[PDB]
Design a protein around this ligand. Structure first.
Ligand SMILES: [Mg+2]
Ligand SMILES: [Mg+2]
Ligand SMILES: [Mg+2]
Ligand SMILES: [Mg+2]
Ligand SMILES: [Mg+2]
Ligand SMILES: [Mg+2]
Ligand SMILES: [Mg+2]
Ligand SMILES: [Mg+2]
Ligand SMILES: [Mg+2]
Lengths: 131, 86, 273, 93, 63
RNA sequence: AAACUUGAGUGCAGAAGAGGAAAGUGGAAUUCCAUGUGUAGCGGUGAAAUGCGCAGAGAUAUGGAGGAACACCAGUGGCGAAGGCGACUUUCUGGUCUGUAACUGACGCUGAUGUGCGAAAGCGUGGGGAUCAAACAGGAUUAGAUACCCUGGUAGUCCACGCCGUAAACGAUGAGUGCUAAGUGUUAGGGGGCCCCUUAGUGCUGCAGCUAACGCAUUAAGCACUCCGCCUGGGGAGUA
RNA sequence: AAGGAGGUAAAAAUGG
C-alpha cells in the first residue's frame, strides 16, 4: 500500500512536469503543503491552492514553464526514505547543483530549504532534492 | 451460512443496533462460516479449493482477533469465551 | 478395516488382521448352535483322504438360513456377528412373528434394517427374490441352483454375481469366477454383495495362526522320496525332471483339465471362467 | 425449493397399468414432506430417437416443492429399478 | 445485428420449447454458432444448456 | 493520549462463471462376442512385406458385453493463487465482480523460517482394461537402422486411497500502492440521454518515457515508495 | 487492400 506520501507527491510533480501539464491535484497533508509553499517561494512552481474538503483535503499545484516552453524543474529526488532515513548536520548540508538547486529539509525549526538551514546553523532530515 | 443465520448472529453479537462491522460481529460470522466449511470438508475431504477459502477466513478472523486484543483486552476475552474459539 | 501390527516380534512382523468393527455382538445365539467336531480330513474309513487338515481351534456350528423361504414377513437385523465356519459374517435377523435366524451378512447391512424375501420384495440389499423377479443387471449373492434347496453360489466374503439376461426358463448370471451360465429362473438369490470385503487382505503372518485355523503343513513333492511322490528322490535338489508336474497320486497337475465330460450343466454353462 | 420432474412411460403400456404407474410415482414424489404443486400429462409423443427400441413415449410432467430431495431421490431410485419408465430428469428451477 | 432473445425480452429459456430450440438448431441437429444466429453470449449459454436438456429428454435429436 | 474516513473489512440490493467434491442419467464412436447373407480378399505403404482370411476373412444387418472421452455450442470467451477446469442432472461447498452508502475505524502490505496445493510420468495396495501405447516381436527402408514408416503388443493410460513434489510449472516479466497521451474491440455490471459517462476484467494499435536492440507502453519493460526471492564469466555441476 | 492471433486438412523412398 502507500508508504511514502512525500515520494508520491514528488513523483506526481515529476510526471506532470514531464507531460508539461499545467495543474496537479493530490491529497493534502501539512508536510506536502509546506513543501509546495517552499517550491512556490523558490520559484519552481507557479501557484499552490488548498481545498479544505473532507478526507484530508486536496493540494492543487500549478506548474511553471519558462520562455520557449522550457521546464523550470529539471528533476526531483527523494533523499530520505522509509527504508533508509537520511539526516545531515549544519556543517554537512549538501548543495544541489553547486547551489543552483535546493535541498528541502525538515528541521526542529520547521521544514525549510538547505540555504536557510545553513544560515540558522541547523540540520535535520533531508526530505528531497529539487533542481 | 444462510442469510437468516447471519442476521441472527449479527443481531446477537452487535455492539449496538445497526452495527454490522464491529470486530465482534465479523469474527462471530467468521466462526460460523468456518464451522460450516469444516462440516462440509469432513464429508468432502478432497475439496482443497474450498479449504483455501476456509484458511483465508481463518486468517481474517485471526487478524480481527489480534486487533481486538490490542484495542480492548476485556472485550477480547469475553468474545473468545463466548465463541469458544481458543 | 485392516489393522497392521507393529513388529514387536518377528512373528508379528508384517502380520495384519481384521479390526472387527462390523461385529455388534460377540456371542452367538444359543438356540442356533450345533456341535461341529473335527474330521481332520479323514473319511468314514478313518483314513486321511485330504492332506493338511487337523487341529485348529474348537468351533460351534451356526445354523444359517441359506434358503430365505420365509416370505412376506419382515425381519429386522438384530446384529452382525463373527462366524468361525465361513469367511463372511452373519446377521441375526428377527421376524415380525418372533422367529430368529442367521443369514449371510451382505456388505452395507446395518443393525435395525429390514429385510424380506419373496416375489414382491423390494430390490435392496438383504432381500431375497426369485431370479424371475430380480431385474437384469442387479448384483446378487447366495444363489440357488435348485429351487428350494438353498443358496450355493456366491457366499464367500465379498462374493457376488451379476444378472445379465432372461431366457425362457433360465436367467443368465456372471459368477465371481467370470463364468457366465444359466440358472433356473425359479431359483432364489439375495440382493447385494457378501460383506467382509477385506477378508482376503489379511496377512496371516506366522505359522501358528494357520495351525489355529486347522491347516497342517504342506510338504513339497520334490523333497520326498520316489516311493512317496513322482517328484521325490534325486541327489541334491532336482528340477521337475519330466514332461509335466505331477500330483502326489501321479496325475498331471499344471494346466491339465479335470472337469468331467457329459455333464448335465455343460449346456447351461455359456462361457467358462 | 421447486423441482420439475419429467418422465417417459413406455408406449406399449396398458391404460390401467399406466394410470397406476403415474399415480404411484406422483405419490412417491409427494411422500417425503414434498407438496406436488401440479402434475399433468402431455400424451404420447414421438421420440427423437428410439429408447429401448421404442419410437413413442407417454410424457408426464410434475412440479413439486420441498425443503429437501428425499422424494426426488426415491423417485429416481424407483424409476431406475422400474422397467416401465424409460427416461426421467429432475430440474431444480 | 440483433439478438432474438434480447429483442423479444425473454429472460429464460425452457428446455421443453422444442419449437424455439429448432430455430437455433441446425438441419442435422447441431447447435448453430452464436456468430451465425446473432444471439448474445449470455443467452447462448442458456440456449446450449436448454438444447442439451432437451436432447437428453429425447424432445430433440442428437444426430 | 484523543479524533477522521479516503485504505482495509462488514451490512443491504444485484451478476456471470468448464471453480471444487460426491452420486445419477445419456448419445456418437472404437474394440470384442453370437448369429444371417456373402466370396478370395482385407489391411497397409513412397512402394512393399509382415499380419488377418478358404476353418469362410474384410463388407453388411441385428443383438449383447465392457472401458474411456464428451461432436456442435466454443469465442485475444469465462472461472481459479498456480497446477488446472468443456455432455447433462441433483446435493454440499470456495472465490470473484457491480451499486449503495448505514456499520468498525488503519484493523494494512510484504513475508525468512514454517505449513499446504501442485501438469505428466513414476511408486504401493485393491479394482478395472475399450482405445491408444514405452518395453517387446515381426515386416519394410538402409552400407548398417537397437529408429522414423507398417503389422501386433505388455506396463501404463482409468477408478479409490496413500506416496513422489518435479515441468519451457512461461507473460521465460514477484507482491502491494499511487501517478503518466490516445484510438478501437470483447466479457459481467451500473448511471444519464442508437448515443454519452462509468467500474472491473480480457485483446489489438500507439504517444511521452524506457531499452543493447528487439520491443514494453494504464493488463509498462515508464515515473516513484515498501517488502520479499534471486544474480555476479563459460565448463567442472545441479556434480561430490 | 495489407498485417497480427486459433483451429484444421491432403501429400511424403534413400544419400549428398
Ligand atoms: Mg494343501
Ligand atoms: Mg530326502
Ligand atoms: Mg514312480
Ligand atoms: Mg545337481
Ligand atoms: Mg528330478
Ligand atoms: Mg499420473
Ligand atoms: Mg506402434
Ligand atoms: Mg521461471
Ligand atoms: Mg479494460
Amino acid at each position: 500500500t502507500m508508504t511514502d506520501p512525500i515520494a508520491d507527491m514528488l513523483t506526481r510533480v515529476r510526471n506532470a512536469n514531464m507531460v508539461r501539464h499545467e495543474k496537479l491535484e493530490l491529497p493534502a497533508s501539512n508536510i506536502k503543503k509546506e513543501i509546495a509553499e517552499i517550491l512556490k517561494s523558490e520559484g519552481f512552481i507557479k501557484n499552490v491552492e488548498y481545498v479544505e474538503d473532507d478526507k484530508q483535503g486536496v493540494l492543487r499545484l500549478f506548474l511553471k514553464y519558462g520562455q520557449n516552453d522550457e521546464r523550470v524543474i529539471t528533476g526531483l529526488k527523494r533523499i530520505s526514505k522509509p527504508g533508509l532515513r537520511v539526516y545531515a548536520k549544519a556543517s554537512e548540508m549538501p548543495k544541489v547543483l553547486n547551489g543552483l538547486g535546493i535541498a528541502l529539509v525538515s528541521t526542529s525549526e520547521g521544514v525549510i530549504t538547505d540555504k536557510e538551514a545553513r544560515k540558522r546553523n541547523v540540520g535535520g532530515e533531508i526530505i528531497a532534492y529539487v533542481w | 451460512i444462510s442469510q437468516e443465520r447471519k442476521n441472527e448472529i449479527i443481531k446477537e453479537y452487535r455492539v449496538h443496533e445497526t452495527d454490522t462491522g464491529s470486530p465482534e460481529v465479523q469474527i462471530a460470522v467468521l466462526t460460523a462460516e468456518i464451522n460450516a466449511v469444516n462440516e462440509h470438508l469432513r464429508t468432502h475431504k478432497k475439496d482443497h479449493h474450498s479449504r483455501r477459502g476456509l484458511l483465508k477466513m481463518v486468517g481474517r478472523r485471526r487478524h480481527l482477533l489480534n486487533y481486538l486484543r490490542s484495542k480492548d483486552i476485556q472485550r477480547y476475552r469475553e468474545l473468545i469465551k463466548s465463541l469458544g474459539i481458543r | 478395516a485392516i489393522k497392521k501390527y507393529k513388529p514387536i516380534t518377528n512373528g508379528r512382523r508384517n502380520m495384519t488382521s481384521l479390526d472387527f468393527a462390523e461385529i455388534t455382538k460377540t456371542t452367538p445365539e444359543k438356540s442356533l448352535l450345533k456341535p461341529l467336531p473335527k474330521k481332520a480330513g479323514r473319511n468314514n474309513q478313518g483314513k486321511l483322504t485330504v492332506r493338511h487338515h487337523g487341529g485348529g481351534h474348537k468351533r460351534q456350528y451356526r445354523v444359517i438360513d441359506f434358503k430365505r423361504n420365509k416370505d412376506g414377513i419382515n425381519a429386522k437385523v438384530d446384529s452382525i456377528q463373527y462366524d468361525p465356519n465361513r469367511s463372511a459374517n452373519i446377521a441375526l435377523v428377527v421376524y415380525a412373528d418372533g422367529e430368529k435366524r442367521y443369514i449371510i451378512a451382505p456388505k452395507g447391512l446395518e443393525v435395525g434394517q429390514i429385510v424380506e424375501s419373496g416375489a414382491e420384495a423390494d430390490i435392496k440389499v438383504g432381500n431375497a427374490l426369485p431370479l424371475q423377479n430380480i431385474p437384469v443387471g442387479t448384483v446378487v449373492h447366495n444363489i440357488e441352483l435348485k429351487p428350494g434347496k438353498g443358496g450355493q453360489i456366491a457366499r464367500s466374503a465379498g462374493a457376488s454375481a451379476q444378472v445379465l439376461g432372461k431366457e425362457g426358463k433360465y436367467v443368465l448370471i456372471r459368477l465371481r469366477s467370470g463364468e457366465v451360465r444359466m440358472i433356473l429362473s425359479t431359483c432364489r438369490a439375495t440382493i447385494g454383495q457378501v460383506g467382509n470385503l477385506q477378508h482376503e487382505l489379511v496377512n496371516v503372518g506366522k505359522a501358528g495362526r494357520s495351525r489355529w485355523k486347522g491347516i497342517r503343513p504342506t510338504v513339497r513333492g520334490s523333497v520326498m522320496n520316489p516311493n512317496d511322490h513322482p517328484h521325490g528322490g534325486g541327489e541334491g535338489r532336482a528340477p521337475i525332471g519330466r514332461p509335466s508336474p505331477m500330483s502326489p497320486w501321479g496325475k498331471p497337475t499344471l494346466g491339465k483339465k479335470t472337469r468331467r465330460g457329459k455333464k448335465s450343466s455343460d449346456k447351461l454353462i455359456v462361457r467358462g471362467r | 425449493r421447486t423441482y420439475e420432474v419429467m418422465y417417459i412411460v413406455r408406449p406399449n403400456i396398458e391404460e390401467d397399468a399406466k394410470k397406476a404407474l403415474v399415480e404411484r410415482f406422483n405419490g412417491i414424489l409427494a411422500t417425503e414432506g414434498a407438496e406436488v404443486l401440479e402434475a399433468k400429462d402431455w400424451g404420447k409423443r414421438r421420440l427423437a430417437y428410439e429408447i429401448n427400441d421404442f419410437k413413442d413415449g407417454f410424457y408426464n410432467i410434475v412440479r413439486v416443492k420441498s425443503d429437501n430431495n428425499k422424494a426426488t431421490d426415491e423417485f429416481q431410485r424407483l424409476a431406475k429399478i422400474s422397467d416401465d419408465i424409460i427416461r426421467y430428469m429432475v430440474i431444480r428451477e | 445485428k440483433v439478438c432474438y432473445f434480447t429483442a423479444n425480452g425473454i429472460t429464460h429459456i425452457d428446455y421443453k420449447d422444442t419449437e424455439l430450440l429448432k430455430r437455433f438448431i441446425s438441419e442435422r441437429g447441431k447447435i448453430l454458432p452464436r456468430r451465425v444466429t446473432g444471439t448474445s453470449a449470455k443467452y447462448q449459454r442458456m440456449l446450449t444448456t436448454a438444447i442439451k436438456r432437451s436432447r437428453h429428454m429425447a424432445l430433440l435429436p442428437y444426430v
